[PDB]
Amino acid sequence: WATSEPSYPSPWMNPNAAGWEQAYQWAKDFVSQMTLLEKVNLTTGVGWEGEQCVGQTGAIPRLGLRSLCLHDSPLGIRGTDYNSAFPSGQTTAATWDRTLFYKRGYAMGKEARGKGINVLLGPVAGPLGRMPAGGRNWEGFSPDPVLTGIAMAETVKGIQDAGVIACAKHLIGDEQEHFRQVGDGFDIDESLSSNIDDRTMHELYLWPFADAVRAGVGSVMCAYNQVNNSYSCHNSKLLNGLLKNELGFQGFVMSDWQAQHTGVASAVAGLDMTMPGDTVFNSGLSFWGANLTVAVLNGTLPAYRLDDMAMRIMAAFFKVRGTQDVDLDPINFSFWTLDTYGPIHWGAKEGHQQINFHVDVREDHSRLIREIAAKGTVLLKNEGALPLDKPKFLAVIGEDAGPNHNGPNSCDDRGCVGGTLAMGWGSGTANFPYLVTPDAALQAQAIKDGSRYESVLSNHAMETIRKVVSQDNVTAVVFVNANSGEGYITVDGNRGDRNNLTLWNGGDELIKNVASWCSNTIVVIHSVGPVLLTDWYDHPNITAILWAGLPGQESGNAITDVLYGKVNPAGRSPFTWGATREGYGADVLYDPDDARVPQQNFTEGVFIDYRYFDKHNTRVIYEFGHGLSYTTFEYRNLQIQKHNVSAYIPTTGLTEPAPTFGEHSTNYSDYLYPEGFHRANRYIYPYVNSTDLELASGDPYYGQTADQFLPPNATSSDPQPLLRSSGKNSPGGNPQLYDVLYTVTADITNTGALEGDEVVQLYVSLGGPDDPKVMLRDFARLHIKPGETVKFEGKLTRRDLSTWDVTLQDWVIRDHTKMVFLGKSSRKLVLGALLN
Ligand SMILES: *[C@@H]1O[C@H](CO)[C@@H](O[C@@H]2O[C@H](CO)[C@@H](O[C@@H]3O[C@H](CO)[C@@H](O)[C@H](O[C@H]4O[C@H](CO)[C@@H](O)[C@H](O)[C@@H]4O)[C@@H]3O)[C@H](O)[C@H]2NC(C)=O)[C@H](O)[C@H]1NC(C)=O
Ligand SMILES: *[C@@H]1O[C@H](CO)[C@@H](O[C@@H]2O[C@H](CO)[C@@H](O[C@@H]3O[C@H](CO)[C@@H](O)[C@H](O)[C@@H]3O)[C@H](O)[C@H]2NC(C)=O)[C@H](O)[C@H]1NC(C)=O
Ligand SMILES: *[C@@H]1O[C@H](CO)[C@@H](O[C@@H]2O[C@H](CO)[C@@H](O[C@@H]3O[C@H](CO)[C@@H](O)[C@H](O)[C@@H]3O)[C@H](O)[C@H]2NC(C)=O)[C@H](O)[C@H]1NC(C)=O
Ligand SMILES: *[C@@H]1O[C@H](CO)[C@@H](O[C@@H]2O[C@H](CO)[C@@H](O[C@@H]3O[C@H](CO)[C@@H](O)[C@H](O)[C@@H]3O)[C@H](O)[C@H]2NC(C)=O)[C@H](O)[C@H]1NC(C)=O
Ligand SMILES: *[C@@H]1O[C@H](CO)[C@@H](O[C@@H]2O[C@H](CO)[C@@H](O)[C@H](O)[C@H]2NC(C)=O)[C@H](O)[C@H]1NC(C)=O
Ligand SMILES: *[C@@H]1O[C@H](CO)[C@@H](O[C@@H]2O[C@H](CO)[C@@H](O)[C@H](O)[C@H]2NC(C)=O)[C@H](O)[C@H]1NC(C)=O
Ligand SMILES: *[C@@H]1O[C@H](CO)[C@@H](O)[C@H](O)[C@H]1NC(C)=O
Ligand SMILES: OC[C@H]1O[C@@H](O)[C@H](O)[C@@H](O)[C@@H]1O
């Protein structure tokens, strides 16, 4: 069995780090004036359903700070009205456009701010996408680390310039939604452990988080799963050794809802804030809260650690926002209802006022949502069918093309299929302000165009369909979908995770039938991820296939732009379209197989998605980074310019000893509930109810000093040595990792008749017997006019060419023959040269 090695003590903030020096100072000037009670309020959630947002902290009224509001989603504001619904992160990734990564972020952030949210619970790098059938991979960006890391840095930078606090979501493992928690139909004693060896962790799953740390993300969420059999929220090597030690993360770490299962041990493991605060939803008891105060008071949790917890939360707050002000606008919505009036303490039915204000907060974001959705559509196949000109008879076919007869928001958290699919289910959702359905957008295009339009919005009226598409001169566009979501909603026996990689609602045989009766058949797929196209992609009557992903509120208008050439395709697949499911290598584990704790050995190593296909030459139908245009592009004249140099010297030194900020009284009666006080039911408070700390806690396991149940040095205050693989005041790793060793340029020439975008992609091969054949390392999206030639330049950093040595515990550049390639895809590599 795998074990998680201990890394202690929990690193405290560096006052000279990166872009936090000022935010550190302002936090220092603020937490210094906090009582122990107030520190426990900022770190402990009020309990599930306790307030307005999906998570809220204790307030600090004496210092003028209201409760902090934390809320979903990574694609728009969840559970409220007059928000926008942006396209998924997966689809956004498919644009391969950093500008759009950022614009979507700043967009989402501005809406969260307008509602009064202080922490937006996004963007997502866990799951990265280890298995195509994973329930939530669509919330992320790509199974590929470089594209995902770029998308994260850019989305985080957007969210926070708005500016609310961004949250790098689900720290590592959690590539699957089965067994993420316990119970729920299965007999497992603990959550699944995904076990990841050290090299895999550094150059695959942690890679994007590094990028989020280096971009300045204010918070990080730990995940429900264990890693080497200790929950990510109790994990020393992960939270202390990797995130806060090596990458030097300066912000605060919050828990996934009910992901914390221990109090003090979790605090020194690295957890700064527990959410929504209970031990368990509606239980009224906390592993922190009252337990947190008696932990300091009885000596076993060092004072410096709770000050660090406070320092991190308040530093994040001050890093965004950018003024020393606290003092926020009111939280103007409520998550638990849409009613205008209701209990502000929803769970307890206490505090009946106006909790919903219906603030339009939408701006003109529909322009951006429609642009991203179109520029993120992938044109998979095009045998002379597209763009559509003025078809005499256009016939749209499929349920996915129509309205949910029950309305766009009929199902809470999007937990059902019906009509068009524009969004997966789970927390990663928002309500649509409207949902432009393809039927309506295409019909209106055809009418303006003078065409004849008929639609059959069913997957099963077969003879009805036949009569429609058999007629002379028919252009048939057929809409099919596949879905997944978070594990707490089962839609048609899919327990969050996809059961299989085929289309839902019999889309396969719907396509096979339409292609059977019509010679110009176009397939559009709305889906959470790849679907096996094997039985029908090469049909001679299917003349084009497009993947439009999860486009959000403007899905209809976006696919019309692409079909009629208003927007020229360019979108590249953020994943591989394989022929079998075994061809992807790793797979979801749907059954614990009598095991008490399901174990997931990540023995595929760094070989997920296209890396796996390329290594074992399993069959690929559309490769990673594939996408077509209505024009053509000629790559010529490769140039690699090598910068000298600067030797990679280690890092190096010794930190400052753990500080204290403010003081705490030792008169236990100071922490009793104030005399008049009224306890909202099940609300999580910081006050003790007995001057007997053992009784105050009510923990039946009470009474051991830190040396009896915490590992060595777990509370140590002494200066700690600096890790070889970090930078001194440089969060993200040894800053020489990001020196540019090579500049790579080619000449990209549009050779078609229509203007368009091109997604030049940069791949490297690091020699190496255990290495992939190609790894993506840079990319660029260029706009080129028909006659034009354009200079693409890419960069390769010292990290870009490195392997993680575990003996050395750093990054090295081994002495293997190494090469760089430029391609139109993972496989369509047209230029290559030796890196000298
Ligand atoms: C000071 O106050 C704090 C706050 O309440 C109080 O903390 C609690 O401490 C106990 C230790 O006494 C913690 O409980 C243990 O937790 C660890 C990690 O989860 C377990 O390994 C421990 O196992 C013991 O007993 C088991 C049963 O035989 C064995 O299997 C095991 O090997 C161990 O012997 C035990 O479960 C508890 O988590 C915290 N509570 C919170 C909310 O943090 C502390 O005890 C007080 N200190 C003093 C000196 O009074
Ligand atoms: C999950 O477990 C794996 C393996 O138990 C952890 O990976 C291992 O990480 C340690 C460092 O944390 C590596 O240690 C080094 O060992 C070399 C000898 O090979 C030694 O010379 C060095 O001094 C160094 O200590 C270890 O090699 C590595 N093992 C593998 C197979 O990669 C992993 O970090 C664990 N993850 C978590 C979150 O606990
Ligand atoms: C820790 O956080 C909690 C929750 O945010 C804080 O509790 C809030 O405290 C105020 C007063 O301290 C309570 O106000 C009272 O309402 C009555 C009428 O019901 C009114 O007469 C009072 O003047 C006051 O407005 C408020 O209800 C309470 N919130 C809850 C949910 O109970 C607490 O103060 C924080 N502790 C510290 C040390 O900052
Ligand atoms: C802190 O703890 C004390 C006791 O540990 C709490 O006080 C007590 O509350 C219980 C009920 O919650 C009272 O007991 C029983 O209550 C019913 C309903 O009133 C009563 O009719 C029965 O005859 C029976 O006594 C108990 O009398 C009461 N004792 C005292 C001294 O208050 C206290 O409420 C807790 N404080 C907070 C802020 O939660
Ligand atoms: C502090 O944490 C402990 C557990 O770490 C909480 O303990 C519960 O106490 C009840 C009392 O009957 C037991 O039945 C449970 O087994 C205990 N553990 C749980 C619920 O996980 C304790 O309530 C916490 N203190 C406060 C004030 O919430
Ligand atoms: C491609 O589409 C055409 C229809 O446009 C299919 O052809 C018809 O085929 C049936 C039986 O094969 C004949 O009875 C009809 O007279 C044909 N009509 C026309 C207009 O050709 C053709 O079979 C389709 N191809 C495939 C592989 O299914
Ligand atoms: C301790 O606190 C209580 C209430 O907060 C107060 O009434 C009492 O006088 C204090 N005692 C000492 C010795 O400070
Ligand atoms: O609902 C709010 C939170 O709790 C859970 O539902 C999800 O796992 C989280 O990702 C989410 O941020």
Author numbering: 32 to 867
Question: What does the primary publication say about this deposited structure?
Answer:
The structure of CtBGL consists of three distinct domains, similar to other GH3 family members: A catalytic triose phosphate isomerase (TIM) barrel-like domain (Leu51–Ser354), an α/β sandwich domain (His396–Gly596) and a FnIII (fibronectin type III) domain (Thr663–Gln867) with a prominent insertion region (677–766). A linker region (residues 355–394) connects domain 1 to domain 2 and a second linker region (600–662) connects domain 2 to domain 3. The active site is located in a shallow pocket near the interface of the first and second domain. A molecule of β-d-glucose (BGC) was fitted at the active site based on residual electron density observed in electron density Fo–Fc difference maps. The source of the β-d-glucose is most likely the growth medium used as no β-d-glucose was used during crystallizations or soaking. Two catalytic residues were identified, Asp287 (nucleophile) at the N-terminal TIM-barrel domain and Glu517 (acid/base) at the sandwich α/β domain II. Potential glycosylation sites were observed in the CtBGL structure in 10 positions, all in Asn residues. A total of 27 glycan moieties were found in CtBGL. The N-glycan at CtBGL Asn329 was located in domain I of the enzyme and consisted of eight monosaccharides (two GlcNAc, five α-d-Man, and one β-d-Man). CtBGL has been found to be thermostable at 50 °C and to retain half of its activity after incubation at 65 °C for 55 min.
Beta-glucosidases (β-glucosidases) are key cellulolytic enzymes that catalyze the hydrolysis of cellobiose to glucose. They are terminal enzymes of the cellulase system as they act during the final step of the cellulose degradation. Beta-glucosidases (β-glucoside glucohydrolases, EC 3.2.1.21; BGL) have been found in the glycoside hydrolase (GH) families GH1, GH3, GH5, GH9, GH30, and GH116 of the CAZy database. They are anomeric configuration-retaining enzymes that operate through the canonical double-displacement glycosidase mechanism, except those of the GH9 family. Here, we report the crystal structure of a β-glucosidase from the thermophilic filamentous fungus Chaetomium thermophilum (CtBGL) at a resolution of 2.99 Å, and compare it with other β-glucosidases of the GH3 family.
